[PDB]
Amino acid sequence: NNCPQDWLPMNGLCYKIFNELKAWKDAEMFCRKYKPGCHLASIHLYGESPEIAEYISDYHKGQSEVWIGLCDKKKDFSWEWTDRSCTDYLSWDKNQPDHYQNKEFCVELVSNTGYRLWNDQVCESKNAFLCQCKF
Amino acid sequence: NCPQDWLPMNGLCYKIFNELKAWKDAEMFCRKYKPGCHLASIHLYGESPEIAEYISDYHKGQSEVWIGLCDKKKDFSWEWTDRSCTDYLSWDKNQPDHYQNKEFCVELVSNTGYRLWNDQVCESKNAFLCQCKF
Amino acid sequence: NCPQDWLPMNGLCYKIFNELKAWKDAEMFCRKYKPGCHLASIHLYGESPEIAEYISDYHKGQSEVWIGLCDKKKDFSWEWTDRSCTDYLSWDKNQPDHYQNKEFCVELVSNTGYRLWNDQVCESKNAFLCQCKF
Amino acid sequence: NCPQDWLPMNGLCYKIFNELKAWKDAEMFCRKYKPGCHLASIHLYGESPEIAEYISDYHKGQSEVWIGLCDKKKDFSWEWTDRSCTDYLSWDKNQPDHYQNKEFCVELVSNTGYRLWNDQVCESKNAFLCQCKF
Amino acid sequence: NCPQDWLPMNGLCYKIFNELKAWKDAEMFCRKYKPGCHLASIHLYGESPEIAEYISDYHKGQSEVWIGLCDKKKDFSWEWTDRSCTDYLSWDKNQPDHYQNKEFCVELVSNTGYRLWNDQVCESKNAFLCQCKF
Amino acid sequence: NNCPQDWLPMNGLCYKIFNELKAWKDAEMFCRKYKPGCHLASIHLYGESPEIAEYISDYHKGQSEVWIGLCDKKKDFSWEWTDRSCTDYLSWDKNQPDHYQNKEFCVELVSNTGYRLWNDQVCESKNAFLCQCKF
Amino acid sequence: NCPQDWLPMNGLCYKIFNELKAWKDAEMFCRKYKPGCHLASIHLYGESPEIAEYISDYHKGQSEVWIGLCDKKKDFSWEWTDRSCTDYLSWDKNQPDHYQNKEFCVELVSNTGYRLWNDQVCESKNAFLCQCKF
Amino acid sequence: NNCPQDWLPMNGLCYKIFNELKAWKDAEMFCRKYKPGCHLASIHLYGESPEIAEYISDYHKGQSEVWIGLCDKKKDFSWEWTDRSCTDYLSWDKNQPDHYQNKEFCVELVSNTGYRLWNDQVCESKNAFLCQCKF
Amino acid sequence: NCPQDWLPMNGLCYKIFNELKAWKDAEMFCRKYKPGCHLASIHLYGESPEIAEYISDYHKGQSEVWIGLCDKKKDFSWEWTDRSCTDYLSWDKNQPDHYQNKEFCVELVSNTGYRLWNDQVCESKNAFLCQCKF
Amino acid sequence: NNCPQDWLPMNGLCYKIFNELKAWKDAEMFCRKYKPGCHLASIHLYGESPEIAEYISDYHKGQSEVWIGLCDKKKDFSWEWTDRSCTDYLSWDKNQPDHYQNKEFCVELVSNTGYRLWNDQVCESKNAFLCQCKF
Ligand SMILES: [Ca+2]
Ligand SMILES: [Ca+2]
Ligand SMILES: [Ca+2]
Ligand SMILES: [Ca+2]
Ligand SMILES: [Ca+2]
Ligand SMILES: [Ca+2]
Ligand SMILES: [Ca+2]
Ligand SMILES: [Ca+2]
Ligand SMILES: [Ca+2]
Ligand SMILES: [Ca+2]
Ligand code: NA
Ligand code: NA
Ligand code: NA
Ligand code: NA
Ligand code: NA
Ligand code: NA
Ligand code: NA
Ligand code: NA
Ligand code: NA
Ligand code: NA
């Protein structure tokens, strides 16, 4: 909050991009075991996506897509944040979500959009990821 | 304003200690760890999931977990050690029950993921969850 | 900022209405009573007993009471009418049950003091609890 | 947001009622006077002298004053009727004492300026102080 | 702190007016209704459904609804009449499109539940949503 | 809720001048029984004296002094407000308090100073008085 | 906060009076209107347009408008009549100018839309804008 | 910052017990010279007393009593805090303050009560003491 | 936080840099210095004097100072790089002037104490002022 | 608010006394060049005086006077703070300000009154001085 100087402060939390390529579950547990009170980031405001988007475009090593903490654990278009927050904001890319081949149930940030809009993607895909934390 | 090995939550800092201690022996450890600490208190439906998940990830152990709830008068009058109000409950199946009329301290049950509570014999030994102001 | 025939609670204002209406009819009655009204939403363990006592003291009859929770998708996707977050639950025992796949609207149960919820058939004509900004 | 005939104190409204009534009558009178009303609960040192003058000046009559503190278990475990915490005591000398046997309700003592408390017979008729939320 | 025929939201008061007026008339009507009023501005993602449901319930008739957003410079430089920041957008599919370079005022689209926007001829006669400060 | 329109709003309390001439101990009781939560006025900040001064000069109908709620109930220079507020501000006139002839234990605003400065006075003197209320 | 015919702005109420008066008498009228009123003061870059528009809408007839800024020392020390700090300026081009003709009071320039300031003779009858605390 | 680690944070202030035995005036000056903005502690709420009590009982090495920043320098029951705070709260033990033999004008916390209640005491005695600091 | 070598003002931390850079190069420097950094934005009349004194006492050289205001689409539409609104202006005499239609980036004028603004060539190597969020 | 330990926290700012002797001109500049966002101290509340008065008395290594950031630049009783704050508070000493021999235009705190009250004195006089900083 109280954020480290290599983290992005925003609306009470601290956000950071991780360039390692991990599957969605791998990345979630990475954040949670990084420090108490960490998850894959949640978004809740129209004005948070641009600030996140620009931050990734400036500190992202590579071009890998970026996981965030939205999941469809019931495979029925009921999307949930892993920080147990409330799905009160959506920023989907065109024609998404689409459950392509019924393989996609996790959510990434699309590089083509500036990491601004969301896409549902195959869980086991190995991407970069964005942790959020309380400090 | 917590140390980076603690859980921030609603202005206080929480932490799981893996050593085994009796309820009283656990409360005293927290109190003497640093000025202004106690066995943790819970006051919101939302704090119960948050704690359960923190423990399930950082509990370098196996056992159940003490919290600072005690039936002092032994008549279902549950006080917190930190002297805060008892305005929230999260019991397990058919708890509290005073099994053998020797159970008066409260623990977090691992079979529930550490979300529900059970009254247990105070002199038994578990891990515990401290609660500190920093 | 709320009239005296209503209960003030956490910035919003509630009132039990005794005329029986089906779930849909009740929601719309609140909506058109005044701009910014819905069937009530509940978000804290502390809000439940305060609503339960208000109903008991001001409710005429022993009928059940509608609240703004329903499953529009008919698959356990519980959504409040006022679009607030489903961040709290107080289900009765063995609920929700989707009994005979006719129950999709949630009521407060009378013989629990109105602390616990039950999903019920939408056409059932109950009392209802409005929630309004002012 | 208090009306003019009430005392505004710390976010609640307080008013004395001079009609003589037993304790359970006083509590239910407030309850049904308006939604969100009970007998007064006192929580701060600074609140006792403020209620003290208010009653001293607007108590048209001469009686003791019920407040919403009672030993519902009859074993010196006192609870407020608004479900609030018991985080403050302001007893008189030699109180509480369960004198004789049935002194389980709490009254404000006129010989203290209505500042200190005495436990008294449930069924005794007194003036009473409602607190409400407007 | 709103009247009852008005919708309270995030510190301001909103109301739908069903008389059909061109954009500049609708702005001037709000302005003269009471000091400190303008055609509504919208600043949060959650504000849109709130307005969308209000209008649907209270829109006597069937029209598009003016809001206080216009492109005075006729070059995609949209400004709110209340001088607030243009920190939020909620366009309909393909809009804004400056059709035939004659569309510079913003309306709410009934075919989206009044959630999404379209740029429209300013002289078109629409219902309108005033926004006042009390 | 707010103050009534014939009252001065200042820092959460309401103040009104009353031109009736009363003894200090009658002034206090008039205020206390005007409405629950009323006492003779209490002043706590440097900037409060000008606001109270100007207000009186405009809505005062007379040339009398004005009682305020400061009292030496002990008769030994222990000045206390009737509202139980903190004696954390002083604005004494020249050579005050004086305990003139061991009879001056109640405090009045001095019209000769614009009603900005205080004077300890005989309590039985009949002056105007300033109430202070919570609404 | 305010009455329904006043402009609420940043915790105060503003209102224009179309009667013509000399500066001194305008100030006197505001002060004896209601306790806690003066000629208006301006402190933020963003307030001047908010006032400029309010007047342009509710000013009947035409003239210039007084505000509560003057110079009693007769140099260039401008003091508000509400004793607030002179921490914001907004003069018209080449103003102030002491056009030694009794020019020591400030008015709003209709040629700017009532946004920028000008020093003009005190005795000149102009309209005025009061600033009240409700 | 907002309280070191061996200090007790409470209601926006920091507190610490010093077991070095000192006189009441000596203890005051010790605090004031420890850091800018320090005094012998001040108590203001019914709930503050037991939090202090529990803290002292746990962290007080030694057995003596404990000074707090309340004294009667007018020697007439005019009790005032050294930090200029308002005497808006009392917590005396039974039969105190008793000005025993007109020697007692400084205040201490009483062991018999768990350091919860107060006692007026000879200002020259040697007790431990409780500092209070803004950080 | 705000390091002791930065200027605290209204929740953000500002620091002068004396290394001479083109405007884009100055912006990309800030953005890459620390997450949450851009060229400075200014929003209050009172912010301009405080920035001015800071630069006059801490900058080295006599270069004009860049800020993050830019006419990106080159039509007198000035936007901040940190995405805050353009609600404040402090232009210099007869500025902006798009001189020779080659000036689209905004600098501070040393000849005004670094208080007023001027549009300038985008690659004019100047000192710059970063605005960060710690 | 984030004051280091050698500074006085008060009402959101940090203050410190410097015993080095410097003129008013020089003292104001040393503060401003110490850290970004510094000036000679400003005072705005009745209660700020005794809190400053006591801090200086405890930490002043000298017998000298103390500069504050108040001066009459126009030279006509238009007292203006150097931090550009409002002159909303006065604490003038006895028979001050007095422009003694039309030479005194800057303001100091006098040791006579425990550094509580103000005197206008000579700009070029070399006194101790008090800085005020945002941290
Ligand atoms: Ca997809
Ligand atoms: Ca058990
Ligand atoms: Ca059911
Ligand atoms: Ca008794
Ligand atoms: Ca269009
Ligand atoms: Ca006298
Ligand atoms: Ca002129
Ligand atoms: Ca004693
Ligand atoms: Ca230029
Ligand atoms: Ca002098
Ligand atoms: Na988030
Ligand atoms: Na807790
Ligand atoms: Na609700
Ligand atoms: Na209460
Ligand atoms: Na709006
Ligand atoms: Na007061
Ligand atoms: Na103003
Ligand atoms: Na204290
Ligand atoms: Na800024
Ligand atoms: Na200051």
Swiss-Prot record, chains A, F, H, J:
Q: Which residues form the C-type lectin domain?
A: 10-132
Q: Which residues cross the membrane?
A: none
* Keyword Nuclease recorded: no
How is this UniProt entry's protein used in applied science?
Can be used in the treatment of bovine mastitis, since it is able to both inhibit bacterial biofilm growth, and disrupt existing biofilm, without affecting bacterial cell viability.
| GO annotation, cellular component aspect | extracellular region
Free-text tissue specificity from the UniProt record: Expressed by the venom gland.
Residues bound to Ca(2+) are 96, 98, 104, 119-120
Give the location in the cell. Answer: Secreted
Where is the site labelled Binds aminoglycoside antibiotics (subunit A)?
81, 85
This entry's Gene Ontology molecular function terms read: carbohydrate binding; metal ion binding
Q: Please give the positions of the paired cysteines in each disulfide bond.
A: 3-14, 31-131, 38-133, 106-123
Q: Which UniProt keywords apply?
A: Calcium, Disulfide bond, Hemagglutinin, Lectin, Metal-binding, Secreted, Signal
**UniProt record, GO biological process:** negative regulation of cell growth
Motif, Galactose-binding: chain positions: 96-98
Site keyed Binds aminoglycoside antibiotics (subunit A and E'): positions: 80, 87
- At which residues is there a site annotated Binds aminoglycoside antibiotics (subunit E')? 79
- Per its Swiss-Prot or TrEMBL record, what regulates the activity? Hemagglutination activity is inhibited by lactose (MIC=2.5 mM), galactose (MIC=10 mM), and raffinose. Is very weakly or not inhibited by gentamicin, kanamycin, glucose and sucrose.
Q: Function, please?
A: Galactose-binding lectin which recognizes specific carbohydrate structures and agglutinates a variety of animal cells by binding to cell-surface glycoproteins and glycolipids. Calcium-dependent lectin. Also binds lactose and raffinose. Shows high hemagglutinating activity on mammalian erythrocytes. It also involved in immunological functions, since it is able of inducing potent neutrophil activation. In vivo, it causes edema and increases vascular permeability after injection into mouse hind paws (10-100 ug/paw).
Q: What else is known?
A: Negative results: the lectin (up to 200 microg/ml) does not aggregate human platelet-rich plasma (PRP) or washed platelets (WP), nor does it alter the aggregation induced by ADP in PRP or by thrombin in WP.
Subunit notes for this chain?
A: Homodecamer of disulfide-linked dimers arranged in two 5-fold symmetric pentamers. Binds the gentamicin group of aminoglycoside antibiotics at the dimeric interface near the intermolecular disulfide bond.
User: What family is it from?
Assistant: Belongs to the true venom lectin family.
Q: What is this protein called?
A: C-type lectin BJcuL
What is the originating organism of this protein? Bothrops jararacussu (Jararacussu)
- Record lineage: Eukaryota, Metazoa, Chordata, Craniata, Vertebrata
